[PDB]
PDB file of C-alpha atoms and ligand atoms in Angstrom:
ATOM      1  CA  UNK A   5     -14.472  39.234  -4.878  1.00  0.00           C
ATOM      2  CA  UNK A   6     -10.791  39.608  -6.404  1.00  0.00           C
ATOM      3  CA  UNK A   7      -9.692  41.190  -3.205  1.00  0.00           C
ATOM      4  CA  UNK A   8      -6.213  39.797  -2.443  1.00  0.00           C
ATOM      5  CA  UNK A   9      -4.097  40.603   0.443  1.00  0.00           C
ATOM      6  CA  UNK A  10      -0.704  38.839   1.320  1.00  0.00           C
ATOM      7  CA  UNK A  11      -0.779  38.310   5.200  1.00  0.00           C
ATOM      8  CA  UNK A  12       2.342  39.677   7.015  1.00  0.00           C
ATOM      9  CA  UNK A  13       4.039  36.430   7.860  1.00  0.00           C
ATOM     10  CA  UNK A  14       7.501  36.471   8.190  1.00  0.00           C
ATOM     11  CA  UNK A  15      10.107  33.611   7.919  1.00  0.00           C
ATOM     12  CA  UNK A  16       7.593  30.876   6.477  1.00  0.00           C
ATOM     13  CA  UNK A  17       9.646  27.881   4.998  1.00  0.00           C
ATOM     14  CA  UNK A  18       6.948  25.646   3.494  1.00  0.00           C
ATOM     15  CA  UNK A  19       3.786  26.879   5.061  1.00  0.00           C
ATOM     16  CA  UNK A  20       1.325  23.658   4.784  1.00  0.00           C
ATOM     17  CA  UNK A  21      -1.772  23.879   7.030  1.00  0.00           C
ATOM     18  CA  UNK A  22      -4.147  26.514   7.727  1.00  0.00           C
ATOM     19  CA  UNK A  23      -6.927  27.424  10.238  1.00  0.00           C
ATOM     20  CA  UNK A  24      -8.792  30.655  10.997  1.00  0.00           C
ATOM     21  CA  UNK A  25     -11.170  31.142  14.125  1.00  0.00           C
ATOM     22  CA  UNK A  26     -13.799  32.888  15.410  1.00  0.00           C
ATOM     23  CA  UNK A  27     -11.917  35.915  15.820  1.00  0.00           C
ATOM     24  CA  UNK A  28     -10.333  35.954  12.585  1.00  0.00           C
ATOM     25  CA  UNK A  29      -6.831  34.770  13.967  1.00  0.00           C
ATOM     26  CA  UNK A  30      -5.161  32.688  11.144  1.00  0.00           C
ATOM     27  CA  UNK A  31      -3.093  30.091  12.332  1.00  0.00           C
ATOM     28  CA  UNK A  32      -0.366  28.555   9.813  1.00  0.00           C
ATOM     29  CA  UNK A  33       1.855  25.068  10.043  1.00  0.00           C
ATOM     30  CA  UNK A  34       5.664  26.326   8.956  1.00  0.00           C
ATOM     31  CA  UNK A  35       6.343  22.846   7.916  1.00  0.00           C
ATOM     32  CA  UNK A  36       9.785  23.213   7.297  1.00  0.00           C
ATOM     33  CA  UNK A  37      10.487  24.944  10.463  1.00  0.00           C
ATOM     34  CA  UNK A  38       8.559  22.323  12.470  1.00  0.00           C
ATOM     35  CA  UNK A  39       6.440  25.259  14.269  1.00  0.00           C
ATOM     36  CA  UNK A  40       2.955  26.435  14.451  1.00  0.00           C
ATOM     37  CA  UNK A  41       2.528  30.637  14.256  1.00  0.00           C
ATOM     38  CA  UNK A  42      -0.563  32.776  14.278  1.00  0.00           C
ATOM     39  CA  UNK A  43      -1.550  36.162  13.461  1.00  0.00           C
ATOM     40  CA  UNK A  44      -4.691  37.862  14.924  1.00  0.00           C
ATOM     41  CA  UNK A  45      -7.026  39.626  12.809  1.00  0.00           C
ATOM     42  CA  UNK A  46      -5.426  43.213  11.341  1.00  0.00           C
ATOM     43  CA  UNK A  47      -2.265  42.155  13.673  1.00  0.00           C
ATOM     44  CA  UNK A  48       1.411  43.094  12.476  1.00  0.00           C
ATOM     45  CA  UNK A  49       2.843  40.765  15.088  1.00  0.00           C
ATOM     46  CA  UNK A  50       3.179  37.076  14.227  1.00  0.00           C
ATOM     47  CA  UNK A  51       3.270  34.734  17.461  1.00  0.00           C
ATOM     48  CA  UNK A  52       4.743  31.216  17.546  1.00  0.00           C
ATOM     49  CA  UNK A  53       2.881  29.211  19.540  1.00  0.00           C
ATOM     50  CA  UNK A  54       4.720  27.193  22.325  1.00  0.00           C
ATOM     51  CA  UNK A  55       4.403  23.399  20.360  1.00  0.00           C
ATOM     52  CA  UNK A  56       7.909  21.418  20.827  1.00  0.00           C
ATOM     53  CA  UNK A  57       9.265  18.516  19.569  1.00  0.00           C
ATOM     54  CA  UNK A  58       7.521  18.757  16.283  1.00  0.00           C
ATOM     55  CA  UNK A  59       8.661  17.224  12.651  1.00  0.00           C
ATOM     56  CA  UNK A  60       7.207  18.176   9.389  1.00  0.00           C
ATOM     57  CA  UNK A  61       3.661  19.411  11.270  1.00  0.00           C
ATOM     58  CA  UNK A  62       1.218  19.604   8.343  1.00  0.00           C
ATOM     59  CA  UNK A  63      -2.629  20.078   9.616  1.00  0.00           C
ATOM     60  CA  UNK A  64      -3.869  22.471  12.232  1.00  0.00           C
ATOM     61  CA  UNK A  65      -7.387  22.956  13.561  1.00  0.00           C
ATOM     62  CA  UNK A  66      -8.602  25.497  16.190  1.00  0.00           C
ATOM     63  CA  UNK A  67     -11.751  24.441  18.168  1.00  0.00           C
ATOM     64  CA  UNK A  68     -14.403  27.059  19.989  1.00  0.00           C
ATOM     65  CA  UNK A  69     -12.377  27.895  23.131  1.00  0.00           C
ATOM     66  CA  UNK A  70      -8.862  28.378  21.083  1.00  0.00           C
ATOM     67  CA  UNK A  71      -7.404  25.098  21.699  1.00  0.00           C
ATOM     68  CA  UNK A  72      -5.125  24.456  18.444  1.00  0.00           C
ATOM     69  CA  UNK A  73      -4.482  21.086  17.178  1.00  0.00           C
ATOM     70  CA  UNK A  74      -1.500  20.004  15.170  1.00  0.00           C
ATOM     71  CA  UNK A  75      -0.663  16.919  12.978  1.00  0.00           C
ATOM     72  CA  UNK A  76       3.104  16.234  13.958  1.00  0.00           C
ATOM     73  CA  UNK A  77       3.413  13.444  10.679  1.00  0.00           C
ATOM     74  CA  UNK A  78       7.035  12.850  11.546  1.00  0.00           C
ATOM     75  CA  UNK A  79       6.321  11.500  14.861  1.00  0.00           C
ATOM     76  CA  UNK A  80       3.048   9.966  13.978  1.00  0.00           C
ATOM     77  CA  UNK A  81       1.029  11.976  16.273  1.00  0.00           C
ATOM     78  CA  UNK A  82      -1.514  14.837  17.355  1.00  0.00           C
ATOM     79  CA  UNK A  83      -0.636  17.341  19.723  1.00  0.00           C
ATOM     80  CA  UNK A  84      -2.834  19.856  21.351  1.00  0.00           C
ATOM     81  CA  UNK A  85      -2.316  23.244  23.335  1.00  0.00           C
ATOM     82  CA  UNK A  86      -4.816  25.126  25.154  1.00  0.00           C
ATOM     83  CA  UNK A  87      -4.712  28.855  24.457  1.00  0.00           C
ATOM     84  CA  UNK A  88      -2.592  30.723  26.845  1.00  0.00           C
ATOM     85  CA  UNK A  89      -0.783  27.117  27.891  1.00  0.00           C
ATOM     86  CA  UNK A  90       2.641  26.060  27.617  1.00  0.00           C
ATOM     87  CA  UNK A  91       2.052  22.487  28.463  1.00  0.00           C
ATOM     88  CA  UNK A  92       1.525  20.701  25.367  1.00  0.00           C
ATOM     89  CA  UNK A  93      -0.745  17.441  24.925  1.00  0.00           C
ATOM     90  CA  UNK A  94      -0.533  14.541  22.921  1.00  0.00           C
ATOM     91  CA  UNK A  95      -3.380  12.763  22.216  1.00  0.00           C
ATOM     92  CA  UNK A  96      -4.548   8.998  22.437  1.00  0.00           C
ATOM     93  CA  UNK A  97      -4.509   8.113  18.930  1.00  0.00           C
ATOM     94  CA  UNK A  98      -3.075   4.454  18.111  1.00  0.00           C
ATOM     95  CA  UNK A  99      -1.296   3.388  14.904  1.00  0.00           C
ATOM     96  CA  UNK A 100      -1.347   6.281  13.050  1.00  0.00           C
ATOM     97  CA  UNK A 101       1.171   6.454   9.945  1.00  0.00           C
ATOM     98  CA  UNK A 102       2.095   9.935   8.561  1.00  0.00           C
ATOM     99  CA  UNK A 103      -1.326  11.844   9.894  1.00  0.00           C
ATOM    100  CA  UNK A 104      -1.902  15.063   7.633  1.00  0.00           C
ATOM    101  CA  UNK A 105      -4.879  16.437   8.469  1.00  0.00           C
ATOM    102  CA  UNK A 106      -7.028  17.386  11.475  1.00  0.00           C
ATOM    103  CA  UNK A 107     -10.342  19.154  12.482  1.00  0.00           C
ATOM    104  CA  UNK A 108     -12.126  19.600  15.418  1.00  0.00           C
ATOM    105  CA  UNK A 109     -16.277  19.815  15.853  1.00  0.00           C
ATOM    106  CA  UNK A 110     -17.968  22.002  17.885  1.00  0.00           C
ATOM    107  CA  UNK A 111     -18.326  19.671  20.623  1.00  0.00           C
ATOM    108  CA  UNK A 112     -14.721  18.998  20.763  1.00  0.00           C
ATOM    109  CA  UNK A 113     -14.311  15.555  18.773  1.00  0.00           C
ATOM    110  CA  UNK A 114     -10.886  15.442  16.536  1.00  0.00           C
ATOM    111  CA  UNK A 115     -10.937  13.830  13.230  1.00  0.00           C
ATOM    112  CA  UNK A 116      -7.637  13.092  11.658  1.00  0.00           C
ATOM    113  CA  UNK A 117      -6.750  11.541   8.096  1.00  0.00           C
ATOM    114  CA  UNK A 118      -4.501   8.518   8.886  1.00  0.00           C
ATOM    115  CA  UNK A 119      -3.105   9.372   5.398  1.00  0.00           C
ATOM    116  CA  UNK A 120      -0.551   6.232   5.133  1.00  0.00           C
ATOM    117  CA  UNK A 121      -3.408   3.846   6.612  1.00  0.00           C
ATOM    118  CA  UNK A 122      -6.092   5.091   4.285  1.00  0.00           C
ATOM    119  CA  UNK A 123      -8.598   5.909   6.716  1.00  0.00           C
ATOM    120  CA  UNK A 124     -10.264   8.873   9.159  1.00  0.00           C
ATOM    121  CA  UNK A 125     -10.315   8.286  12.845  1.00  0.00           C
ATOM    122  CA  UNK A 126     -11.704  10.339  15.320  1.00  0.00           C
ATOM    123  CA  UNK A 127     -11.822  10.909  19.443  1.00  0.00           C
ATOM    124  CA  UNK A 128     -14.123  12.474  20.991  1.00  0.00           C
ATOM    125  CA  UNK A 129     -13.158  14.884  23.659  1.00  0.00           C
ATOM    126  CA  UNK A 130     -11.494  13.465  26.657  1.00  0.00           C
ATOM    127  CA  UNK A 131     -12.106   9.851  25.304  1.00  0.00           C
ATOM    128  CA  UNK A 132      -9.428   7.173  24.546  1.00  0.00           C
ATOM    129  CA  UNK A 133     -11.667   5.284  22.089  1.00  0.00           C
ATOM    130  CA  UNK A 134     -10.266   5.698  18.692  1.00  0.00           C
ATOM    131  CA  UNK A 135     -13.222   5.139  16.045  1.00  0.00           C
ATOM    132  CA  UNK A 136     -12.725   4.369  12.293  1.00  0.00           C
ATOM    133  CA  UNK A 137     -15.543   6.492  10.441  1.00  0.00           C
ATOM    134  CA  UNK A 138     -17.011   4.567   7.833  1.00  0.00           C
ATOM    135  CA  UNK A 139     -15.683   5.409   4.777  1.00  0.00           C
ATOM    136  CA  UNK A 140     -15.000   3.302   1.960  1.00  0.00           C
ATOM    137  CA  UNK A 141     -12.049   2.710   0.223  1.00  0.00           C
ATOM    138  CA  UNK A 142     -10.028   5.468   0.799  1.00  0.00           C
ATOM    139  CA  UNK A 143      -6.496   5.893  -0.686  1.00  0.00           C
ATOM    140  CA  UNK A 144      -3.919   8.437   1.144  1.00  0.00           C
ATOM    141  CA  UNK A 145      -6.936  10.843   2.709  1.00  0.00           C
ATOM    142  CA  UNK A 146      -5.305  14.079   3.107  1.00  0.00           C
ATOM    143  CA  UNK A 147      -7.412  17.066   4.124  1.00  0.00           C
ATOM    144  CA  UNK A 148     -10.178  16.613   6.524  1.00  0.00           C
ATOM    145  CA  UNK A 149     -12.830  19.497   7.329  1.00  0.00           C
ATOM    146  CA  UNK A 150     -15.934  19.403   9.516  1.00  0.00           C
ATOM    147  CA  UNK A 151     -19.152  21.602   9.246  1.00  0.00           C
ATOM    148  CA  UNK A 152     -21.384  22.819  11.751  1.00  0.00           C
ATOM    149  CA  UNK A 153     -23.848  19.877  11.263  1.00  0.00           C
ATOM    150  CA  UNK A 154     -21.189  17.184  11.665  1.00  0.00           C
ATOM    151  CA  UNK A 155     -20.598  16.183   8.309  1.00  0.00           C
ATOM    152  CA  UNK A 156     -16.812  15.097   7.530  1.00  0.00           C
ATOM    153  CA  UNK A 157     -15.392  16.115   4.067  1.00  0.00           C
ATOM    154  CA  UNK A 158     -11.647  14.423   3.229  1.00  0.00           C
ATOM    155  CA  UNK A 159      -9.656  14.920   0.058  1.00  0.00           C
ATOM    156  CA  UNK A 160      -8.911  11.009  -1.077  1.00  0.00           C
ATOM    157  CA  UNK A 161      -6.377  12.185  -3.413  1.00  0.00           C
ATOM    158  CA  UNK A 162      -5.344   8.428  -4.179  1.00  0.00           C
ATOM    159  CA  UNK A 163      -8.401   8.272  -5.692  1.00  0.00           C
ATOM    160  CA  UNK A 164      -8.580  11.719  -6.990  1.00  0.00           C
ATOM    161  CA  UNK A 165     -11.733  12.484  -5.536  1.00  0.00           C
ATOM    162  CA  UNK A 166     -13.322  14.474  -2.564  1.00  0.00           C
ATOM    163  CA  UNK A 167     -15.554  12.538  -0.548  1.00  0.00           C
ATOM    164  CA  UNK A 168     -18.144  13.485   2.585  1.00  0.00           C
ATOM    165  CA  UNK A 169     -20.033  11.604   4.927  1.00  0.00           C
ATOM    166  CA  UNK A 170     -22.853  12.821   7.192  1.00  0.00           C
ATOM    167  CA  UNK A 171     -23.084  12.135  10.861  1.00  0.00           C
ATOM    168  CA  UNK A 172     -24.275   9.138  11.425  1.00  0.00           C
ATOM    169  CA  UNK A 173     -24.158   7.819   8.220  1.00  0.00           C
ATOM    170  CA  UNK A 174     -22.443   4.837   6.793  1.00  0.00           C
ATOM    171  CA  UNK A 175     -22.619   5.783   3.100  1.00  0.00           C
ATOM    172  CA  UNK A 176     -20.261   8.607   1.747  1.00  0.00           C
ATOM    173  CA  UNK A 177     -21.231  10.578  -1.080  1.00  0.00           C
ATOM    174  CA  UNK A 178     -18.287  11.608  -3.759  1.00  0.00           C
ATOM    175  CA  UNK A 179     -18.509  15.288  -4.489  1.00  0.00           C
ATOM    176  CA  UNK A 180     -18.690  16.350  -8.022  1.00  0.00           C
ATOM    177  CA  UNK A 181     -15.874  18.310  -8.514  1.00  0.00           C
ATOM    178  CA  UNK A 182     -14.572  19.019 -12.096  1.00  0.00           C
ATOM    179  CA  UNK A 183     -11.030  18.882 -13.555  1.00  0.00           C
ATOM    180  CA  UNK A 184      -9.169  17.934  -9.898  1.00  0.00           C
ATOM    181  CA  UNK A 185      -5.931  16.762 -10.062  1.00  0.00           C
ATOM    182  CA  UNK A 186      -4.603  15.449  -6.589  1.00  0.00           C
ATOM    183  CA  UNK A 187      -6.525  17.354  -4.195  1.00  0.00           C
ATOM    184  CA  UNK A 188      -4.966  18.511  -0.635  1.00  0.00           C
ATOM    185  CA  UNK A 189      -6.760  21.174   1.528  1.00  0.00           C
ATOM    186  CA  UNK A 190     -10.195  21.174   2.213  1.00  0.00           C
ATOM    187  CA  UNK A 191     -12.374  23.707   3.950  1.00  0.00           C
ATOM    188  CA  UNK A 192     -16.506  24.233   4.378  1.00  0.00           C
ATOM    189  CA  UNK A 193     -18.319  27.514   5.356  1.00  0.00           C
ATOM    190  CA  UNK A 194     -21.208  28.131   7.201  1.00  0.00           C
ATOM    191  CA  UNK A 195     -23.574  27.737   4.244  1.00  0.00           C
ATOM    192  CA  UNK A 196     -21.702  24.543   3.254  1.00  0.00           C
ATOM    193  CA  UNK A 197     -19.673  25.410   0.224  1.00  0.00           C
ATOM    194  CA  UNK A 198     -16.778  23.137  -0.082  1.00  0.00           C
ATOM    195  CA  UNK A 199     -13.587  24.912  -1.036  1.00  0.00           C
ATOM    196  CA  UNK A 200     -10.683  22.623  -2.320  1.00  0.00           C
ATOM    197  CA  UNK A 201      -6.994  23.179  -3.398  1.00  0.00           C
ATOM    198  CA  UNK A 202      -6.441  21.404  -6.407  1.00  0.00           C
ATOM    199  CA  UNK A 203      -2.748  21.066  -5.709  1.00  0.00           C
ATOM    200  CA  UNK A 204      -1.890  19.665  -8.946  1.00  0.00           C
ATOM    201  CA  UNK A 205      -3.459  22.321 -11.058  1.00  0.00           C
ATOM    202  CA  UNK A 206      -2.286  25.151  -8.798  1.00  0.00           C
ATOM    203  CA  UNK A 207      -5.894  26.694  -8.024  1.00  0.00           C
ATOM    204  CA  UNK A 208      -8.275  26.833  -5.442  1.00  0.00           C
ATOM    205  CA  UNK A 209     -11.821  25.802  -6.132  1.00  0.00           C
ATOM    206  CA  UNK A 210     -15.403  25.872  -4.648  1.00  0.00           C
ATOM    207  CA  UNK A 211     -18.589  23.711  -4.745  1.00  0.00           C
ATOM    208  CA  UNK A 212     -21.565  25.335  -3.083  1.00  0.00           C
ATOM    209  CA  UNK A 213     -23.657  22.495  -1.345  1.00  0.00           C
ATOM    210  CA  UNK A 214     -25.251  19.894  -3.575  1.00  0.00           C
ATOM    211  CA  UNK A 215     -24.343  21.726  -6.446  1.00  0.00           C
ATOM    212  CA  UNK A 216     -22.283  20.830  -9.724  1.00  0.00           C
ATOM    213  CA  UNK A 217     -21.452  24.519 -10.677  1.00  0.00           C
ATOM    214  CA  UNK A 218     -17.839  24.936  -9.664  1.00  0.00           C
ATOM    215  CA  UNK A 219     -16.185  28.178  -9.529  1.00  0.00           C
ATOM    216  CA  UNK A 220     -12.430  28.868  -9.511  1.00  0.00           C
ATOM    217  CA  UNK A 221     -11.371  31.509  -6.908  1.00  0.00           C
ATOM    218  CA  UNK A 222      -9.998  34.535  -8.236  1.00  0.00           C
ATOM    219  CA  UNK A 223      -6.582  34.491  -6.591  1.00  0.00           C
ATOM    220  CA  UNK A 224      -3.725  36.070  -8.584  1.00  0.00           C
ATOM    221  CA  UNK A 225      -0.008  35.027  -8.408  1.00  0.00           C
ATOM    222  CA  UNK A 226      -0.803  31.603  -7.021  1.00  0.00           C
ATOM    223  CA  UNK A 227       2.420  29.310  -7.269  1.00  0.00           C
ATOM    224  CA  UNK A 228       1.874  25.940  -5.323  1.00  0.00           C
ATOM    225  CA  UNK A 229      -1.022  26.650  -3.074  1.00  0.00           C
ATOM    226  CA  UNK A 230      -1.894  23.732  -0.757  1.00  0.00           C
ATOM    227  CA  UNK A 231      -3.951  24.489   2.487  1.00  0.00           C
ATOM    228  CA  UNK A 232      -7.254  26.230   2.104  1.00  0.00           C
ATOM    229  CA  UNK A 233      -9.475  27.761   5.562  1.00  0.00           C
ATOM    230  CA  UNK A 234     -12.655  29.917   5.191  1.00  0.00           C
ATOM    231  CA  UNK A 235     -13.973  32.642   8.302  1.00  0.00           C
ATOM    232  CA  UNK A 236     -17.287  33.430   8.853  1.00  0.00           C
ATOM    233  CA  UNK A 237     -17.304  36.269   6.746  1.00  0.00           C
ATOM    234  CA  UNK A 238     -16.251  33.999   3.768  1.00  0.00           C
ATOM    235  CA  UNK A 239     -12.978  35.173   3.176  1.00  0.00           C
ATOM    236  CA  UNK A 240     -10.751  32.350   1.964  1.00  0.00           C
ATOM    237  CA  UNK A 241      -7.018  31.782   3.338  1.00  0.00           C
ATOM    238  CA  UNK A 242      -4.503  29.556   1.271  1.00  0.00           C
ATOM    239  CA  UNK A 243      -0.895  28.624   1.822  1.00  0.00           C
ATOM    240  CA  UNK A 244       1.385  28.898  -1.064  1.00  0.00           C
ATOM    241  CA  UNK A 245       4.763  26.651  -0.339  1.00  0.00           C
ATOM    242  CA  UNK A 246       5.756  27.560  -3.728  1.00  0.00           C
ATOM    243  CA  UNK A 247       6.456  31.377  -2.574  1.00  0.00           C
ATOM    244  CA  UNK A 248       6.154  31.000   1.291  1.00  0.00           C
ATOM    245  CA  UNK A 249       3.265  33.116   1.448  1.00  0.00           C
ATOM    246  CA  UNK A 250      -0.382  33.253   3.097  1.00  0.00           C
ATOM    247  CA  UNK A 251      -2.834  35.092   0.736  1.00  0.00           C
ATOM    248  CA  UNK A 252      -6.368  35.947   1.970  1.00  0.00           C
ATOM    249  CA  UNK A 253      -9.578  36.751  -0.552  1.00  0.00           C
ATOM    250  CA  UNK A 254     -12.801  38.722   0.529  1.00  0.00           C
ATOM    251  CA  UNK A 255     -15.746  36.982  -0.438  1.00  0.00           C
TER     252      UNK A 255
HETATM  253 ZN1   ZN B   1       3.698  17.283   5.304  1.00  0.00          ZN
HETATM  254 ZN1   ZN B   2      -1.290  13.457   0.478  1.00  0.00          ZN
HETATM  255 ZN1   ZN B   3      -1.679  19.239   3.183  1.00  0.00          ZN
HETATM  256 ZN1   ZN B   4       1.755  21.203  -1.225  1.00  0.00          ZN
END
């Protein structure tokens, strides 16, 4: 549909990452304010999550237990916070250089786009064994998403492309998006449809699984969209750091 709502967040300064959970709570990294905020479905009351020490936080993800993960790229680290907790945990990633995106699968594995090092890395839940995923020839990989089957999707914007890698595969596929210019956020729905913020064209596009028929989502008044997320009903959420807002569009 074209049913668009601006969510009632307040005081945002360059929102960047966005994620939505199974309850419809929307999480946003307020990049210029070094904080992560949330709004429950239908709520009017934005809440700041109790992270501390962030410097340009960027990607955000939320697992099935409500633990929130944030890439803190100024500090080359990934931080998590269990729902309701006041102690944040710095995950044991090593050698990150400006990490931009984070995703978490149903087993709790955490995937990070290590933007400055041209790689995607992961940690299984509770492990210190960082593993590099066998993508090929990435160049400033930026956004990352993981679907219910463990396929990992990456905006490989230094190569102006979106790639995907099935769980256990050693051979990535390049998705046939049309007309991209430097993609940033990526998200994937329960049907495997892939949503991408085509940042250099100020638009959000989608491609159903295995399809070549790209659709531009009918948002109106987008200025500089950046991050994208999609909920279990197919509603799409986009951060716009040109006008400091978060917009949602029903399916
Ligand atoms: Zn950033
Ligand atoms: Zn980037
Ligand atoms: Zn980004
Ligand atoms: Zn941007």
